[PDB]
Design a protein around this ligand. Structure first.
Ligand SMILES: *[C@H]1O[C@H](CO)[C@@H](O[C@@H]2O[C@H](CO)[C@@H](O[C@@H]3O[C@H](CO)[C@@H](O)[C@H](O)[C@@H]3O)[C@H](O)[C@H]2NC(C)=O)[C@H](O)[C@H]1NC(C)=O
Ligand SMILES: *[C@@H]1O[C@H](CO)[C@@H](O)[C@H](O)[C@H]1NC(C)=O
Lengths: 901, 630
């Protein structure tokens, strides 16, 4: 118009992020008083609101620090708020609101607001027609502007309105996007759940697993679908143990005193007490402070055992007594186990080992006792004079083998002695009668790996009930022999036979300490401590999963290991692929493939909670009656509900009819909305104290047209209870159009807007004006047709034209005589006024095809030429002639030549 | 009889410089000190380093700063003084420190990108470099994305993003993250994923009182405020309803449903006592709470916003009294100081509220800015359980409306009933960094041995470390000596002062007497970070305008910004990052578990978070628990 800024000059606001300035800056600016100052230039976005600016600092000196928020308020004197919804359903007609705020102190504004045409949307604005309202906005107030549209293609489509004021240089534009979604219900399907375990059924040829795609046959076209692969790991282990409670061992901490032998009887329970407690880690339960004091007693025992070391590196009860074979073989045993606890001298430990070998070993390997220990109760089951040629050579052997690592480079005759004493035991193992001898010599041979064959069978079948190595005598010789046995089981790694043997020891409830409890106490706890070390605990999750998806070119290799805080791995693909998985290794896993997609729906309507009927009738300028009828779909009468109304562009409700509703009980209308006027009451809200659930609650008021304009925008009414926005219902109203729904032809889920000219035009229509318009690059088809049948409906008419000649054949392979359905909106039944058995000259574009070949249908659009062809005996009439001569000449100029270009 | 002592923290930590206090009492000449840390039990030598010499010129107070590389685990701290060795087993925390997570928004729409930063800092809050595992769990608790990043050379700031797919479960999503070295200790932030659009105004509902008094005839008066994000006041209509909660269950009061006109950005709506009591005896409602649900609709119907205040407590008394700040042990016959903490029913501190003990009788005291009141009561030299009850003497109110609370303080048990006490008193005021504190050392013991107490040893605890140790000189006859203790940004937010003296007395018996105290310091940032306008003038900016953003901070630091549309916080304001939420975490992770003092000397120490072991056998209790008692 005049004295206003045109539409193309206006740059729309487009940048509306919800958060921005996600920056990382360093305060390196020269500091003044330890204070750095950074200056940043920023382009504030297009939002009219208030921004919150939050800064966090990190300094290796001052640590972390969250700063107080800094708010920036962005505003403008005149603007539009285009309030879209999050999403809209494809083909669903909905109303959108556009609010124009005028915040100028005392300056009213004559404004123009225009919705811009977008092919993805079916609204009033088209290519060649604008949709512009002229409206006035009072000082310090807002104005709601309703637009109805229809999204025709899914995805991130875009609505955009502009507005300008007259006589001033003030303009604004808002370009916002909204996600358009198809029609369906969220469905989640399980594709494959297999147990990944090579070895178990998954053959030694490591498991291969074929995984099919998902059905997704009812997947609504034009929707993404994600496949999520998952690697669940089943761990469950348990090589379990129940160690002896430490509170039961308080007596095993004994102060070592006395002579060469008595000192050893007291250092025994203490060393074997610390050892067991260090391995079972009960030190908290026992009392953590008591360990340090137990270290002094073990160091005190060892120190006092140096004064009884004879020059020959051997030990005896006294210093004047002849050295004992067994005692020196026990000193080695104890000191060999207390190496990590106290400082065991290598000269002392290995010296006694060297002495045993060179002095107290017979050629055949046997060790001979020459000075029996005075305390004949500390030795255990050796006291029994039966087979002491084996028992001693088995005892001295174990002591030598536990000093191995410590005395290999210091004693070179050790390797020769170990094998020698093993040769004698091995040969005479099959001739043993006592269970005690079978155990202690069985542990001495198992340490070399020399307990196999018939010997191994003898050791195992020596157990009574497969849980104890007992001899008809004292029980502490039996606790000892089961303890050497449990040690041998652990050495050979026979973990199938062990649990029963250990359960027997635990049920004995032996806690060491007593008369001659030296061996029993050192051995029963040496065995139950090595029981906690020869674990394992699981076994191991060592899977190697490979995923080959025909989509990706690179293989996906996952390694699920135990002792890793995860055991879960996932991969996502946007394409429904038929892939294969190959596992490898130990462990029992899981493989779950879950796809996600949109399935086809069978519809509700919906509203679910509200019924709605809206009627628009003429009154008994224009003035009409708007009747509204609503009802709640529950069991109770709904509470305060809202009736949100928009007007038929250029219509204002009747004030006097409103006052009458306001005074009605259970109904409310703000003073605000009352005293608006013709001015601009295009929107109205009637608050309802309630709506009934049994029958309809109906109201009705008169609407007056204050500004008459061609092509009016359908009104819209929307109900909803105050507490819930989603559960709403919205009906439309237009004098003509069915129920506010704009014209659109649909098949399945594809739709195209139909709000346009019914045909091209109508000032003299000559032959030249026909050859020019029928040979434009676009024009595809040209037929002389005859109207056989006309089918009336509620939305689209169907004119079954039988083609009588194909002047210019197109993409449609139509022979002469066949019939083709021409579709036209109901609003075009009067302007076309096509009659049966008559002829017409028609031509249109290729975009005016409907359906799939060979079953195509034609659309009588704004590029379709509809012209009445007079009959044979009608050309005789001296007024149709001028036309007849033109059509008959348009016939032979298209048949012979065709198009100039 | 020289006595060598050692003090360290209850719980030692990995990859951190834990300090260790070395001492020699009644010592002569120099004394060579070697410190060792071994894994427990056995020998693996975790820290051999740290050897020092205690000098007469230091009164024989030394210090070794050591680091530990890197069921529960334990170390054996070992301390050899010349030939004499002292060792103590101490507990070790696996916790490497803290992780803080920050997302851009509070809520997100399927199809958008979640921007999130991980803040990796030790216990002392300084940035550290570690490997970090990061998970993202859905509502039902299923991880869909995991990263394995490292804050090495990264100045403690690990940026990250995640594109929410359009196909995703709505509701509460969670980001969980932990240190590779400590999978047990986990750090989480929730973010909502929902289908939403940003509204153009906000709605604030504020009840006149932050609580409800069952006998207030007037009822619950609520002010429904509504203004546009850009400032202007809203014109519209509001629906408001009320409800009763107890405790996770809500009951809606249908007959309280009102419709109120929102004019000039405001509206008034009241829940009359009548309606309340009808919707359910009145005293049965005490303990429960009230919530207000607002729904404001612009007279245009083009925009609609819902808001809600919840947890308005129903109470007989407008106050609560707490002794969480007063120590539970006194010194028989010595003045006892009380830290009464008076809150408003919601949990906020109540300013200027006079309090008093039972009777009283002039003896009063007003609550300050932090909601704390300073009472001091004179005591009997009896070993009887001191029982103290407190009010609460606000006029305008009534005895019936006044609040009350009752604690019980036990006597400090003395070494073989020697009647030798120590008491640390501090003048109560909001301590700011930069100020100097006047710590008061009052000594109680018979004059027969008083001349032997020549110095007190004090130790400052903070964030769970030994911030500073020192010696307070004393001459014979001085019952009360003062320590001018400077307060720095390092004492934030709270600190413990523990001090003690040792001597030979009774019958040649070694005696240790200690006392602790907990002082709150003005919570803030250790340094400073200010964000403001660079342009020194003008009104509001216009959409698409360039503006200068001034940032004032500490030299060397790295700053990470973000700008969110305050519209978002109309939808969800929860799970934001605050400096206050940081100091909240730090505090809850103190090894010190008590306002001060202790049943004995071994109690003062362990309760405060320290270990005292001597060459006379005077040691603390072995702490087996990482958590505080309860
Ligand atoms: C433990 O003994 C060591 C000496 O072996 C001492 O550490 C030193 O502590 C002082 C302050 O007590 C430090 O001086 C101050 O450092 C800050 C920065 O940390 C500085 O800004 C001040 O101006 C002041 O100079 C000193 O740097 C530090 N020495 C070392 C080893 O770095 C201290 O006596 C004892 N530490 C305690 C009380 O835990
Ligand atoms: C399917 O959706 C439901 C909610 O409607 C959700 O609880 C479930 O986890 C989904 N199925 C799967 C396993 O993806």
């Amino acid at each position: 118009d005049e004295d206003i800024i045109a539409e193309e000059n206006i740059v729309s606001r487009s940048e509306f992020p919800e958060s921005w300035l996600w920056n990382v800056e360093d305060l390196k600016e020269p500091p003044k008083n330890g204070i750095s100052t950074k200056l940043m230039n920023i382009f504030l976005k297009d939002s009219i609101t208030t921004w919150e600016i939050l800064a966090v600092s990190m300094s290796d000196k001052k640590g972390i620090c969250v700063a107080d928020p800094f708010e920036v308020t962005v505003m403008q004197d005149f603007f539009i708020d285009l309030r879209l919804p999050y999403s809209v359903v494809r083909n669903e007609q909905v109303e959108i609101r556009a609010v124009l705020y005028n915040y100028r102190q005392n300056q009213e504004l004559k404004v123009r607001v225009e919705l811009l045409h977008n092919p993805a949307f079916c609204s009033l604005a088209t290519t060649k027609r604008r949709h512009q309202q002229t409206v006035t906005i009072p000082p310090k107030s807002s104005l709601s502007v309703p637009y109805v549209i229809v999204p025709l293609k899914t995805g991130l489509q875009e609505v955009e309105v502009k507005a300008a004021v007259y006589h001033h240089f003030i303009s604004d534009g808002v370009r916002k996007s909204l996600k358009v979604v198809p029609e369906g219900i969220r469905m989640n399907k399980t594709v494959a759940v297999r147990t990944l375990d090579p070895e178990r059924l998954g053959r030694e040829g490591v498991q291969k697993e074929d995984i099919p795609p998902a059905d997704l046959s009812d997947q609504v076209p034009d929707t993404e679908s994600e496949t999520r692969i998952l690697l669940q790991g089943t761990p469950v282990a348990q090589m379990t143990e129940d160690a002896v409670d430490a509170e039961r061992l308080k007596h095993l901490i004994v102060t070592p005193s006395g002579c060469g032998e008595e000192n050893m009887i007291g250092m025994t329970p203490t060393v074997i007490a610390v050892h067991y407690l260090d391995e079972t880690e009960q030190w908290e339960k026992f009392g953590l402070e008591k360990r340090q004091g137990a270290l002094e007693l073990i160091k005190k025992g060892y120190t006092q055992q140096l004064a009884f070391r004879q020059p020959s590196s051997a030990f005896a009860a006294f210093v004047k007594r002849a050295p004992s074979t067994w005692l020196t073989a026990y000193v080695v045993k104890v000191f060999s186990l207390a190496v990590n606890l106290i400082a065991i001298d290598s000269q002392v430990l290995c010296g006694a080992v060297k002495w045993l070998i060179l002095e107290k070993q017979k050629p055949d390997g046997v060790f001979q006792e020459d000075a029996p220990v005075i305390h004949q109760e500390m030795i255990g089951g050796l006291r029994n004079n039966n087979e002491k040629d084996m028992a001693l050579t088995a005892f001295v052997l174990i002591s030598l083998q536990e000093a191995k690592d410590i005395c290999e480079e210091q004693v070179n005759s050790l390797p020769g002695s170990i094998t020698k004493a093993g040769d004698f035991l091995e040969a005479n193992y099959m001739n043993l009668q006592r269970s005690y001898t079978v155990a202690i010599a069985g542990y001495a041979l198992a340490q070399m790996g020399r307990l196999k064959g018939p010997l191994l069978n003898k050791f195992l079948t020596t157990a009574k009930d497969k849980n104890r190595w007992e001899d008809p005598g004292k029980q502490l010789y039996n606790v000892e022999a089961t303890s050497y046995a449990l040690l041998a089981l652990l050495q050979l790694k026979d973990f199938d036979f062990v649990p029963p043997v250990v359960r027997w020891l635990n049920e004995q409830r032996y806690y060491g300490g007593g008369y001659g409890s030296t061996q029993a106490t050192f051995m029963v706890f040496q065995a139950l401590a090595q029981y906690q070390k020869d674990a394992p605990d699981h076994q191991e999750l060592n899977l190697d999963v490979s995923l080959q998806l025909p989509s990706r070119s690179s293989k996906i290799t996952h390694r699920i290991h135990w002792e890793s805080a995860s055991l879960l791995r996932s991969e996502e693909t946007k394409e429904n692929e038929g892939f294969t998985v190959t596992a490898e290794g130990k462990g029992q896993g899981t493989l779950s493939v879950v796809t996600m997609y949109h399935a086809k729906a069978k519809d509700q309507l919906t509203c679910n909670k509200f019924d709605l009927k809206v009627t628009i009738k003429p009154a008994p300028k224009n003035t009409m009656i708007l009747e509204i009828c609503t009802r709640y779909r529950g069991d109770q009468d709904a509470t305060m509900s809202i009736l949100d109304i928009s007007m038929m562009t250029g219509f204002a409700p009747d004030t006097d009819d409103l006052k009458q509703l306001a005074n009605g009980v259970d109904r409310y209308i703000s003073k605000y909305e009352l005293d608006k006027a013709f001015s601009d009451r295009n929107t109205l809200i009637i608050y309802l104290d309630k709506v009934s659930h049994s029958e309809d609650d109906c109201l009705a008021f008169k609407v007056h047209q204050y500004f008459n304009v061609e092509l009016i925008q359908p009104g819209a009414v929307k109900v909803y209870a105050y507490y819930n926005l989603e559960e709403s219902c919205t009906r439309f109203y237009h004098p003509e159009k069915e129920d506010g729904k704009l014209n659109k032809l649909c098949r399945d889920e594809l739709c195209r807007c139909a709000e346009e000219n019914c045909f091209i035009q109508k000032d003299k229509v000559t032959l030249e004006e026909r050859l020019d318009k029928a040979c434009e690059p676009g024009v595809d088809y040209v037929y002389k047709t005859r109207l056989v049948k006309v089918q009336l409906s509620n939305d689209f008419d169907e004119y079954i034209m039988a083609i009588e000649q194909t002047i210019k054949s197109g993409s449609d392979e139509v022979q002469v005589g066949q019939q083709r359905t021409f579709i036209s909106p109901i609003k075009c039944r009067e302007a076309l006024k096509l009659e049966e058995k008559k002829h017409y000259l028609m031509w249109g574009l290729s975009s005016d095809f409907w359906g799939e070949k060979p079953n195509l249908s034609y659309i009588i659009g704004k590029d379709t030429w509809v012209e009445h062809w007079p009959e044979e005996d009608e050309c005789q009439d001296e007024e149709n002639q001028k036309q007849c001569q033109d059509l008959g000449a348009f016939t032979e100029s298209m048949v012979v030549f065709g198009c100039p270009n | 009889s020289p006595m060598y002592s050692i003090i360290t923290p209850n719980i030692l930590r990995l990859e951190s410089e834990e300090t260790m206090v070395l001492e020699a009492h009644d010592a002569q000449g120099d004394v060579p000190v070697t410190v060792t840390v071994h894994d427990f039990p056995g020998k693996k030598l975790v820290l051999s380093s740290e050897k020092t010499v205690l000098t007469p010129a230091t009164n024989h107070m030394g210090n070794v700063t050591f680091t530990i590389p890197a069921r529960n685990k334990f170390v054996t701290v070992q301390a050899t003084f010349g030939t004499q060795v002292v060792e103590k087993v101490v507990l070790v925390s696996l916790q490497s420190g803290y992780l803080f997570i920050q997302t851009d928004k509070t809520i997100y729409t399927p199809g958008s990108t979640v921007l999130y930063r991980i803040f990796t800092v030790n216990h002392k809050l300084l940035p550290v470099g570690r490997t970090v595992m990061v998970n993202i769990e859905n509502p039902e608790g299923i991880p869909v994305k995991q990263d394995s990043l490292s804050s090495q050379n990264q100045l403690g700031v690990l940026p990250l993003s995640w594109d929410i797919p359009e196909l995703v479960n709505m509701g509460q999503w969670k980001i969980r993250a932990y240190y590779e070295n400590s999978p047990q200790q986990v750090f989480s932030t929730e973010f909502e994923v929902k289908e939403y659009v940003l509204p153009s105004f906000e709605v604030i509902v504020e009840p006149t009182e932050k609580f409800y008094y069952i006998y207030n005839e007037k009822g619950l008066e609520v002010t429904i405020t509504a203004r546009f994000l850009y400032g202007k006041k809203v014109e519209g209509t509001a629906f408001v309803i009320f409800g009763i909660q107890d405790g996770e269950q809500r009951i809606s009061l249908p007959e309280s449903l009102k419709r109120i006109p929102i004019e000039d950005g405001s509206g008034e709506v009241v829940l009359s006592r009548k309606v309340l009591l009808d919707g359910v005896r009145a005293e049965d409602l005490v303990g429960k709470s009230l919530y207000v649900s607002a729904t404001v609709i612009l007279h245009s119907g083009s925009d609609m916003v819902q808001a809600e205040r919840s947890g308005i407590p129903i109470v007989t008394s407008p106050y609560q009294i707490h002794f969480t700040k007063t120590p539970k042990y006194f010194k028989p016959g010595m003045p006892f100081d009380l830290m009464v903490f008076v809150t408003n029913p919601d949990g906020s501190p109540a300013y200027r509220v006079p309090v008093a003990v039972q009777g009283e009788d002039t003896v009063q005291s007003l609550t300050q800015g932090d909601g704390v009141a300073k009472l001091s009561i004179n005591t009997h030299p009896s070993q009887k359980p001191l029982s103290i009850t407190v009010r609460t003497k606000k006029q305008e109110l009534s005895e019936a409306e006044q609040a009350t609370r009752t604690m019980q303080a036990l006597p400090y048990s003395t070494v073989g009933n020697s009647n030798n006490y120590l008491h640390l008193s501090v003048l109560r005021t909001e301590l700011r960094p930069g100020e100097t504190l006047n710590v008061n050392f009052l000594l109680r013991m018979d004059r027969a041995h008083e001349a032997k107490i020549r110095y007190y040893t004090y130790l400052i605890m903070n964030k769970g470390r030994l911030l500073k140790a020192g010696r307070q000189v004393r001459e014979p006859g001085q019952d009360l000596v003062v320590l001018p203790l400077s307060i720095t940004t390092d004492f934030i937010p709270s600190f413990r002062l523990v001090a003690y003296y040792t001597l030979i007395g009774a019958s040649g018996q070694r005696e240790v007497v200690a006392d602790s105290v907990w002082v709150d310091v003005k919570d803030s940032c250790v340094g400073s970070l200010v964000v403001k306008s660079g342009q020194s003038e003008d009104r509001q900016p216009v959409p698409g305008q360039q503006m200068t953003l001034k940032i004032e901070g500490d030299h060397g630091a790295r700053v990470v910004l973000v700008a969110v549309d305050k519209g978002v916080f109309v939808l969800n304001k929860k799970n934001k990052l605050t400096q206050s939420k940081i100091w909240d975490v730090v505090e809850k992770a103190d090894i010190g578990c008590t306002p001060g003092s202790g049943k004995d000397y071994a109690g003062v120490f362990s309760d405060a978070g320290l270990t005292f072991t001597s060459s006379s056998g005077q040691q603390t209790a072995q702490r087996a628990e990482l958590q505080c008692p309860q």
